[PDB]
Design a protein around this ligand. Structure first.
Ligand code: ADP
Ligand code: MG
Length: 234
């Protein structure tokens, strides 16, 4: 499957934070959207997800323009989303966190939802934390729970907004592995970070954004030799 955003633009108080941004992610690849803080990465994700209204642009899947679909209908079309800020229910156990999102799986019985919850905990290596409250988890464990939550809906595409934010150096490795596992599973993965070199390593290719503009696209090696890129990090 192919997910495409075309000519996205968004302004707050007239200030252009995203201008003419176009990108694509396909099933079974990891695509980066990388750039400094305030560059417009989250705003772009919001427009793809349907969280904020666009001033301009189109969101499309295959031969289907879905720009007019609300967030809930876009999710049902297979777009999943991991927010930058914490999204875990802090007072709820890891298990209750998953069961809560699995309630949207109208295709499953109540007992198949529990099966799925157990499968997800095993897949994300959090099954030993079944009854731990979200509040008591490390950043790395929290993130594994939040990513599991995002997959409960069964998306074809997952937008990961700074999945490494707030996670210790060590837990970063398992998350990277899980992301690679998602891609191998056939999901299209789109991922943001301000740490270019750290996240670049996990992408097949990446768009670089600065002050609302797309300034380059390429593989990791291409990006790291790109004059327009260097020009931003002089
Ligand atoms: N509701 C809002 N009103 C005004 N400015 C905003 C609003 N939301 C975000 N911004 C600004 O837009 C810019 C881009 O934000 P964002 O997309 O979060 O960048 P990134 O995610 O790459 O750090 C930031 O400078 C931010 O302060
Ligand atoms: Mg952001």
């Amino acid at each position: 499957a192919t997910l495409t955003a075309k000519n996205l633009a968004k302004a707050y108080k007239g200030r252009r934070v995203v201008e003419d941004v176009s990108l694509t992610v396909n099933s079974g690849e990891i695509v980066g959207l990388l750039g400094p803080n305030g560059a417009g990465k989250t705003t772009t994700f919001y427009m793809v997800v349907g969280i904020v209204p666009r001033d301009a642009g189109n969101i499309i899947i295959d031969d289907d323009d879905i720009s007019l679909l609300p967030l809930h209908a876009r999710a049902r079309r297979g777009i999943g989303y991991l927010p930058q800020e914490a999204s875990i229910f802090r007072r709820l156990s890891v298990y209750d966190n998953l069961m809560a999102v699995l309630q949207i799986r109208d295709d499953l019985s109540a007992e198949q939802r529990e099966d799925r919850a157990n499968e997800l905990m095993e897949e994300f290596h959090i099954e030993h934390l079944r009854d731990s409250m979200g509040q008591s988890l490390s950043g790395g464990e929290r993130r594994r729970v939040e990513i599991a939550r995002a997959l409960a809906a069964n998306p074809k595409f997952i937008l990961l907004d700074e999945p490494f934010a707030g996670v210790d150096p060590i837990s970063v490795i398992d998350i990277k592995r899980i992301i690679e596992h998602l891609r191998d599973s056939g999901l299209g993965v789109l991922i943001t970070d301000h740490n270019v070199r750290e996240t670049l390593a996990v992408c097949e290719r990446a768009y670089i954004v600065s002050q609302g503009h797309l300034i380059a696209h390429g593989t990791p090696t291409e990006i790291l030799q790109d004059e327009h890129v260097k020009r931003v990090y002089l």
